[model samples]
Target chain A: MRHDEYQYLDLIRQIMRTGNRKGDRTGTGTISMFGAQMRYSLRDGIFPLLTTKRVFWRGVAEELLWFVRGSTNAKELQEKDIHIWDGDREEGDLGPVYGFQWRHFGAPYADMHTDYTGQGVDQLQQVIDTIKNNPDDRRIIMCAWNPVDVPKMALPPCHCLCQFYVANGELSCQLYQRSADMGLGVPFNIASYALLTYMIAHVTDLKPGDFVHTLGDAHVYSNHCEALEEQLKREPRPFPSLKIKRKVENISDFKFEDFELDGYKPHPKIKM
Target chain B: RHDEYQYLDLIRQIMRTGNRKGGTISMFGAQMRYSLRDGIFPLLTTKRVFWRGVAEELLWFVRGSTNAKELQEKDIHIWDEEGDLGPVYGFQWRHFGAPYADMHTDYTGQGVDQLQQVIDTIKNNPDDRRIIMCAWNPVDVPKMALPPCHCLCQFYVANGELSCQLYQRSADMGLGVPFNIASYALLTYMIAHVTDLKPGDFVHTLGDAHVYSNHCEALEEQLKREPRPFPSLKIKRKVENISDFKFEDFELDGYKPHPKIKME
Candidate 1:
């Protein structure tokens, strides 16, 4: 087991026993806590979740693809056969939080001149170009909080903002999450974003750099306390390899089924 | 001018005077300093640079959108032509990173997995990585709309408080740079507020912070304007949940500045 895995497992244990019990607007009310850190360089050890329960590799992969595609509709995710958000979908909600904000972010009325309409803007490519042509431009940033859409959202965005910086041709990302679900969500978030750093590096012709995750309400839920303790007792397994099955040259062309996880054998499943 | 605009304008003035040379990058050899007076807001007043740009960029970070097409609808076009180059920070954070080819699997998982790790580390171990977040992904550059420009930023936790330092390899003095400082500082405040930590210093380290080749005249005009007093920005509502914060949650105080400075 790598040191990072054990460290994360310890976090899960702490959240379970000492997490603050609070009712949240999101149906998954949590014992919320805040502010934690994890650093894994591909140069160090490959990051893989060593769960004491069944790992949802497909769900993780599909959710990742969903974000990549920049689609907010849950139906698009459903097509990939990953239903982690099935409960919300059944409740007639659009997985519109991240995708909608990212792809179709509305502009403020005051900022809009004659060229302005209600249509959203594209921030992802802006950061990419800034990094490439203007590597020193410090304004490389992307945000998800929409003032107009907050009331309509089923759940407010936790991963609210991200900024990019380049130093000596190396690119790094800093994420600001308003809320973080420590046990069920943190591992996947870390691994997923780290993978993102590598991917961006590959395409931009830069080296893989650091991944910084800043949190607001980072905590473990009361319901998963025992499972967390059980997870701590079990030693962390070896880091697993993540393999994608397809050949995607463009960012838009990538899909969920394009991924595969190999050599991942961890402890049995524990329900959240 | 509005307080937010005033503060932003003052930053431009400082950059104009402080930045005499022109290059792709500008370096702040010495630490540039300023402070805000009581009950004033400090937004930029010189240029027509949008506060919404700052706000939209903040939202994009949370949304993690990688491609320009996705960001176009929001009226924000920082990287309109760079989508084919590859997914930049947004792709890496929200999606997994670029793919690599092998025998059985063609794509390898190399996305940033920092969100959960940060929470766990701060709760259990602060010494680990000091909660660093990166934006530079090497493999995805070729497909990116643009290459990696502004690279990495790290946050340190000391005495249970959060402070952020951004090492920007390049900075655009005329246009986008000031917005970056204000936005990131605001982000630091938001993160600190949620983590039960007080907001500390935003140490902005510059590599090649400079004005654009085309915006020289405007930069010079900005240098002539005398800097006004600094302003304080406040997040209006007390938010318990990080996700629940909206644009209405912020309020600015203690800012004063001259008229709007035009930008091309």
Candidate 2:
């Protein structure tokens, strides 16, 4: 197994066994632990998911597409047929979240004359292009944290920020997730973003570097504790290949259906 | 009259003034103050330096991109001497802090990965709590390739608006201060955009915002010259979206300044 996978699996298991469960202001409680880091060396192997539970390729694909599209509303997600945040509503409404913040963040000022309408800044494409053109620049990065829009969000951003680095023409990405749902959200977050980095590298003609995940609150919920233990018992299978069905030159162009996972089988899916 | 430019320029001017007279590092000293009222360029037009490096660095921090190799390619040398040696902010922010072990554990993760958490907090629960990310890790102080030069960054939300404050332990007025002002202000802009708030005040509280001992003559020369009326910065074409903003989207207006201030 790649070093990152080993570390990631270790984190998953650790959080599952040792994490503390507590109720949060958000109605959904979390099994929480603070400050975890996973270092993956790209030279070893391409870092991909090593979930003992059945991988949710569709959810992964949809989330990536959602980030690319910068859509916060469930309407677009529904179009893609993914509903992770479907039932979670604030004041009984689920209009928009990350995508809205990323795209139209509303006005900074209340006065109509001074109100500045928000606009999109394509971070994904910038990372890919910077990797291709300025691989040696350590400043290659993309950020989704907008303080202006944070208050307007249904849920504050957990996968709030990500940065990319290129060394010797090898591209690597590190994601700073403030709160990680290790059992349910992490597998997808790691695999999806790592794959996104890989795809970006392939397009940029750079070698895959490392995927570093820095988590603020990384934990497995108490309810999902037993399931994670079962997952630890199962051996990690070989990484499956991610086949992009469509030719996507730009980061904005990728869709859920654009990817296919070939040659991967895992233990039955575990409910969180 | 651009508030951003005035705010940023005030920061630069304060640093320059302090450097000439030897500024104080403690809180009791006369610190610089800049106000932003909405129309002006927030960059140092008195120098011929490319603003891209500083801008890119801020973006990198927001993105949490923490390696020197990528930055080296851009010809921006924030950590050229400390490549992988641990001077880089990215390394400090993402990796485990030094002494690697602790009483509670062998290795503990330091550096609050603010970016991802900002996103998740904005996405999952907007009002959960103040979404703050930090960089000053006390444990990694000695092992750092470069000592903790820039210390502490705090983000807070008030009346549903986001504001940022950065504390620099030591700042070189002529060379580093300009970059610091522009970088952090831009960071405030970026973070505000992502979290669904308008850019608020960029509180730059500096410990020693001064010029290098060697750069004294150059500082005197700059002080002699009158600052051109501050310029106005405009983010051309409404940024209806956050991720869609390009380098070209930024446009500056009413910027009039004296000749470039050379660093000795």
Candidate 3:
């Protein structure tokens, strides 16, 4: 509880020091706090990709594009040299996961073999359109949570939903993540969403606003404790800047070569 | 900059100073933590809040009934101006559109009953991480009149106490939040009572928290009022099932407030 606020290392330390001791699903006893609301400012031209750990920029970009494309097959990402989701893939298909939920929403999803394209409301497309047309609409949201669809997945989504607000000629994104692994997954999740917020703003002809990340269960696994402590010992570095090389009309049109991270000098990767 | 270290402090801060922009003056994010350890139900004592609609609406959702007409029949007109609030909250909880063949259509009783599922989880496996019930449906959103404000809720069990957390996407502070606080608090209480666990905390987290410009002056005048001790919720009888709860089985004691403040 005595840790700093909003910084990368501070969250990790807080989860370790003052989090409640509880048993988790992964058989890794965790210490966690219930809710936390953290924000990242996109105004200073500094990307919130963590400086404490070497967050793989390429993997983050490719994986998000895979989601935007609404492809349920993990082979799409594997072909692009991203193996972040290797463990969860089944029969070259992961059920109605993030990608399926992002683009296809609540459509009837069978599996990877059957075509689920153009079935549900295209939420990502609707989000882009809504942001451009009705900026003040409070119902402008993209939800990955389908109540009936949880049992069919390899895993239920942890980053539950997101809402976008447009005000003052700037676009802001707020994400509600239901479960967070403070050490391993949070940095990746933060950078991925921050990148997504920036990308959407660029295409919609608006300046980037804040990325507010609100967490439900913020936890640190018992096994990742030492690595987190080592992470906290490292001095924080200046944030890197992300640049989108090409302009695209649709959100789904952006490719892997579109993004680049500049001046990301950081400590070595902290693997648990 | 509506920044404050405490929950009540944040409310007072929004009235005095918040960015005067957007559709109204907006404060981006806020959190409310209510611990029910002392049995203090968090109905705001600063002003009069209609507890009838709050109770009726929550019970209506718990019963999994859609069609605001059912609510209006119960003398609750809050769901009156609402279009397509269809299968939104109650429907999602009881029958979450699983029966509908197409995504855009309505539920045919083919959806999963999330409330029943969560209660069973609380009764059997209380330590599961996936004990979350969400009301936001991506396919059903465009078909509805108004989207869910309290989008999703997660229940946690620790040390024989039941705790609840809510992620509300948009909040109207002066009018809607008090109702939401009471509504969700009642949900936690009812769920804990049926699950046989003592009630713990109700954590409220908001995405876009705003006080409308028209209500700013009213809030300013109301902030001068002092907050009184909260009332303890009393359930007269032991209701073994959550669905068996009726309107008359409960009472609120010690809820003394100042005059009612109305903002339009």
Candidate 4:
């Protein structure tokens, strides 16, 4: 049996070897595989930060914290100096995207400035409450894919829907990502979702369990082959432990400064 | 060698290590792929599946009829109602985002026709990545008799074959999953037939897969039975449109299986 650390690299290698040569929206082309699944253990406080190359920890943490705030404006990320979503945004508004749908799903989007406090279904709050009250509830889900809002969105959600599960005093989450850029976006997704599970488990008083990532169109961009090839040759180092600096009572109260990673020494960043 | 082993293996796994959740034992996050190539439909052979019910329910959904009464009129008792199902699977599939008044109202040119768009995309540009249909409407869930279990599904095309993957939030391993497998496989076949392509794989992905405590005995009995070969599905005539597919058009061959196990 293979260890948990090797699955990410294995997926990259699998796609490289057997993926279909397909043209993508970017016109860069890709070697793509449809419908892939990977499992990473989040037990024992271990973060699934990829070891072959250093993931941008600041961007991952800040962007997720921004999402937790239910923000759809790119200017907020830019205020924190994160530019991942800069290209798709207009006048600091990126329509009803991940956070907007996560918090205020089905509510009419008027601009990014309006206060949507008591609007549509509060799915994030509902999911947390369900976890606390009924751990065995299988309907604990948060969705970002709204057909009505797709045309309104600058970018349709790639990490589309997520469901939470709890059993034996542990919390697990699975994300059904509709599209995956295996080299760049996937590593960020893996860490971001793992951190999400950890944060939810932290506030709910349960241990973090498995983070199952299921992909629809898992692909490696043609331009990213050289960087990925270099990453595949490197050995996986020991996973770092995540230390929450403070006892956060609410899921939304935590800040980027609260998360601390210990012993995450890896190869230098591989720029694609 | 048969694909029925995948279904049985999941049953065994749930019984052995599945955590007890009140009345059911469950494991989270399980996936299985069944081949639909060369006219091979993955209707299980360990026990008899109700083909009539599956076909009727599928056709009803294709018509975008949210009234459970339509299914009841045909003696299909799966949905178990004559009143409205409140914008469930069928309504969401064809008329998503359409304003709902009642089951009697016509929503012909309303809301996004996701099923039709999926077919058009497959025919026009087979490599489109956003060919997806989502049924878990947050606004509609409160009014629904039951929230959707099979929430989202995405279609893929490669090598001139159509494949589908369903992301079901919850699954009843004993009773519901068998019907679900057949329903989605039939859906893939119907879409592929209209688009003029071969059926590929039906990827069934689940969030929390549970087996009811009461159904354990029947499932264990089911595991002992050897799997017979899967039956081949044949469409009698070329269906021009997806909505035109009828129950009489489908033909199943070599579907021998053990007697059905009734569960409480």
* Top-scoring candidate (lDDT): 4
Stretches off by above 4 angstroms in model 3 are: A1-8, A24-27, A88-90, B1-8, B12-23, B81-85, B98-109
In model 1, where do residues sit more than 4 Å from their true spots?
A: A14-19, A23-29, A48-54, A88-95, A107-118, A167-170, A243-247, B1-264
Reference contact recovery of candidate 4: 0.75
Worst 10 residues of 1 chain B by lDDT: B29-38
Residues A115-217, model 1: lDDT tens digits: 3323556566566677778765555666565434544566666665666656555666666555577777777776666666655554566665556655545
Docking class of 2: incorrect
Q: What's the ranking of the predictions by DockQ, best on top?
A: 4, 3, 1, 2
Q: Who is ahead in TM-score, 2 or 3?
A: 3
Candidate 1: how large is its RMSD? 16.0
Estimate the TM-score for candidate 4. Answer: 0.97
Error of 3 at A233 (Å): 1.9
Off by over 4 Å in 4: A24-27, A88-90
CA-only RMSD, every prediction: 16.0, 20.0, 3.6, 1.7
Sort the candidates on TM-score, descending order.
4, 3, 2, 1
Worst-scoring 10-residue span by lDDT in model 4 chain B:
B77-86
Candidate 3 chain B lDDT trough over 10 residues, lowest sum:
B1-10
Per prediction, fnat is 0.04, 0.00, 0.56, 0.75
List chain A TM-scores, every candidate, in order. 0.79, 0.81, 0.93, 0.96
Report the CAPRI category for model 3.
medium
* Candidate 3 local Cα displacement, residue B205, angstroms: 1.4
Please give the DockQ score of every candidate, comma-separated: 0.04, 0.02, 0.60, 0.81
